[PDB]
């Protein structure tokens, strides 16, 4: 067997320190590897929608509780109000976040899309590899809406245990979604055949179509890495991702957080059920939970007085129900509302912004659905070996004070590399590697007394 | 009041509404044929008994709305809204007009007012015929040697027309008021 | 009559398809026409404020019943301290809104203002048209404030039913709103003599002062319109605009989702007041729910107990009832948090995330007041008509690499005009319309593999 | 003494009128001085985590209550259910904020830095100088985690009258915070050594470590002010930002509206317990709250009646807490999301959005450790001495209608200063200062009606 438990303390992770300098120049931390890697989210957007007939779960059909129930007719009419109207909130958020997932236009969609990128999100036309490994791993209890109360009859098996059936028992109808999941692929389709028709400025108008692969070293570019380096690399990056895109067959366990959030989502909705099915059976002073046994077992004087205690406690576990649904249904329309600025930020174009996503700024991001809500998968890319090099602020012509430089979306380093027979390189902002510094890679500013006094070779500008 | 709501001798800077005046009752209006002076009074705040059933309020003529026969004239909440009386006329009942109270509290300097809502001031007085309990006054101590005042948001005591124009009281009373210390 | 009704599918709009290309050019979708458009939205920021006199709520007055509850005084001052912090919590969520709408620096406004644009939301110097508009259709009961009481008393109509005359009879009192109607005008005004000063740069110091039309020209070369376009369409544009805003007259029906909610809003603060007053004639094992007629039918050790039961049940019900504004209040002020970034992102600047607004990218929007809120609207501006067209990713010079350029917020397209005499044009990004290729246009880049060999017409650059 | 009160109504501050004018020139008004100044937030982040021992809270050990609560020991172990869900969530919470708050690098921190600015914020190496006051100024009731129960015990002071020990007379137990405040500030002080680091485009791979003086030269760049006003003003601009800074020992008082914040979250933890303590005291019909006095007092046919009236009053205050903790949980957890967001958008970056933070558009902000949360400090920019100049739209060659020029981050105005020799000049958007038009401060645009035609000295372009 394994032994005791061991005591220890939590680590912490010191940052790599890099020294301040004063004077001219300065330390400059600089990736020289990288990773892409996959972070997922799980927004929900909905609850069950639900509906109770107040009466049949109240009393099963005896005349002696109906006669008692008209006194309280009103309570029942409440209970019909509030959850009529939730379930008038959940279908209309449904309708406003698909709304703004429909794209005016896209790209047809086929086997081999995307080139080098292996892409398993494709449609086996259907909904995707991805979307029928969550909806088979998460437990999911059987659905109604197909034949239902038909499997809970005698024509059906012995093993059934659903709460399809308890339905019926408690008064309960699950109602159906509001969108059909062959019309919830078809808007999933629609977002993945826009993607790289978003760049090159607007996106909400002009629709680009054009090469995949041609719109991810744009986006590359767009972080600061250098075209040079996205030019020889290409097969490398198409690697990287590929494997990253891997990963996600080992996605679907209870240790992925996003996988247990979906989980628990499916979890809170049989719960809520089996809450109001567990309470027919409890006593509130009554004899028996059964109306029926009450009427036989007593005279009328005594009997009237069992059924009205049997009903207000069934009466009060419909009141709290109805407050906790209204709770959860709120809170669903606000989780709904984040997934919409997600689908216009991340999945739509490039975000600048971090905080959302995987840390590791953002390229391309995809949607896809989930039980009662939508998954998130955002790449992102994570750099490796840093090493710190030698950089100046500007450089300036040491014979003309007004003729000064600063890099644009990169930096100015003292040159390691035996190609460049020049005391200055230029190198991108997410990647090193050194290059020539020309007219294209800066941009004349204002002289400043911390920029380098350059006395020979500068060829932007050349005098 | 407020010291025991709050269970304290130091009550923070505010305002802050409490017990409301009543009304109080004028003499009894009775009708029931089958004991010879007030079997109207067309308009006050009286006690009633019409037949049996009692109550209290303000009697105005007023035009017919019910099925006369029945006497009767209820809302959807049951409440008495009108009588058909052994003189043939229609009587409208509109309850009686309670006094919302709230007062005015500076911490720091120690002092208060007070105000009584939309009312208006023509129904104020000095003193005071409607009842709640025991007294005000701790504010007739300065608020006995002015009129009410009549103000946009209601009548109050002690406030002093300054017409000063301050960016913040800490102590507004809605609309565009405030209670300048 | 009418007959049977219809079983029908919901339709799926396909959006438009754009064959992905491989090779060294594209085909771009480009819209041809446009309209513009308003969407507009309600946010709530606060919730009609109200106290409760929670004895004369329990009982009227009487001394049997006062003495009694003199054994439960401390639950009508938790009910009394609840309701007071949540007013103080909508007070100061009301001012921090107003701080953050004052600008610091205006036009004054005149009839006339805004030149070819016809501008209903300009004041009648009051509030607007369109907040006369909102304020007479939506059905709101008569407010207090004013006599208030003197109108439930016997010098008033006796069809008066006002809530208002209810609240003396539960011991309600509503407060005032802490603005004024004439102050809540002078901050919306003041946000309408900020549009227009707020673009060239910062916006949140200098103020530019300029032409509202002007502005307009400038927020639509913001979007990939050029300027030769808007030079020439001025007047089209102008009646444009005004057709967009000559829609507003028809949208304060129930069919307008965001009136709608405006109404809905007013009907929720009268349904909280109603639950209250319905409650003082429900019996809880009295004989009556007055007070006075238990007094009267009873011997005081009968007496008691059956006014015990009836506080009981008066004080459970309070206590409901501040649970439900503590929630209410909460939800107003997070509310009230995304208006007061709404007007920092959308009427006081152009936004381009996207997202938010009707979905046309974004021009200048509009604020009014709302009953309970704010009230926006949205000018978006929507594409039509969208053609194919073929597109390069960039172009270069034959006889030097080195000479590339790429078009700058619009596209390089084939040329299908008959004025230009090159075979490359340029075109803006939301709106098709051919130009020649100038130094204007354009940048210059590092040379790609896609980019097209040009064997002969350059001007830029024309080496 | 202080006399009467005083009716006033609330000032409007009217904002600065501008004129908006026709023709080819327009009014612009633009700020002369300014301060700097600092706001303050409180963001909670989390709840005191709670346990209860639902046994002993609604009975002291009692057999005969123990016998009667077997019938009740489901509700004991869904309130344990409860309870620890929340708790897990509360610890979720605080691990997914600081896995954003930590950098992947920063500088060392020594005293001196920061150079010219003085910062208090630095650690005493400890926390900080700002938090010391923070912890100590709040009233904050007596850790437990240290020895406790041995505090309460009789090895301690008489006058100890703390909720750690109602703890063991009503069963709660407050569990530990998850993180330990050395940790916390080795987390803060890694994002104080991140500042000026980011700045050079990307932020989120390189890492630049260059002056913290010259980083908010740069940030005073973008935000519109021309180098040559910040090259010569250095020392003033030192002095200014420091008065800021000391501003901020006197913002401990309840008249500050973030520090009250803090104060009424401490008070909230407090009153929730309390709330259980006071309620074991409370009867509901018995003869004592005491179970052992009706043990003493009674034999076993009313004893168990008087037992089971007390046992079901406090198992619905149980309840009812439990009710409370998960809402408060739930704000606390969307609470906690906002403050991740302003770390990565206000901490780490300058924002350009306005909306967040004190307005003066933002510079540099910082965050230190809170009871319950983060409080954030923003340093912004305020504008003071506006005037109105006379400004152009752009100019251009009057000899060459292609040769036209329009201002970048800033203005053309007439010369009002005496050392230029031209009829226009250039200033920057958030500062009046003139200068030279030159090739730095402008671009090439498009020929429009409003530009004006110059007819002789202009620079860029000679020609």
New interface residues.
Partial sequence: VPGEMRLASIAFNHPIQVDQLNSSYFKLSIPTNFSFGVTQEYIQTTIQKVTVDCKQYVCNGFQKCEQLLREYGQFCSKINQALHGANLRQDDSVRNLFASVKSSQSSPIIPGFGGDFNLTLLEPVARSAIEDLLFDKVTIADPGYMQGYDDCMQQGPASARDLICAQYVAGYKVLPPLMDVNMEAAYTSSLLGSIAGVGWTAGLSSFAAIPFAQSIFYRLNGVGITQQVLSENQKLIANKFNQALGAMQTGFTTTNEAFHKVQDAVNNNAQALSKLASELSNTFGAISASIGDIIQRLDPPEQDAQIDRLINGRLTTLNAFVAQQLVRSESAALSAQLAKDKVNECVKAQSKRSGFCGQGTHIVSFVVNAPNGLYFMHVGYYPSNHIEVVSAYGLCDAANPTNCIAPVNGYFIKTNNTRIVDEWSYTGSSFYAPEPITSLNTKYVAPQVTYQNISTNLPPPLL | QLH???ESFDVES?V??V??F?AKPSGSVVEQAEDTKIASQL?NCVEYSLYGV??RG?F?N??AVGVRQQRFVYDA???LVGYYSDDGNYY?L???????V?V?Y?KE?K?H?TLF????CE?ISSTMSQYSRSTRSMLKR?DSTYGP?Q????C?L????????????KL??????????
Same sequence: chains 1, 3, 4.
């Fill in positions: 025991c709501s709050y505010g802050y509404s017990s409301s009543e308009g009692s109550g303000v105005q007023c035009t909440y049951q409440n409208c509109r309850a009686c007009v309670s006094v919302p709230s005015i500076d300097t002092t007012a809502g939309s009312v208006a129904h300065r005042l103000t946009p948001v209601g109050v002690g406030l002093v027309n300054s017409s000063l124009f301050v960016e913040d009281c507004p009373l809605g609309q565009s008021l405030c209670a300048l210390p």
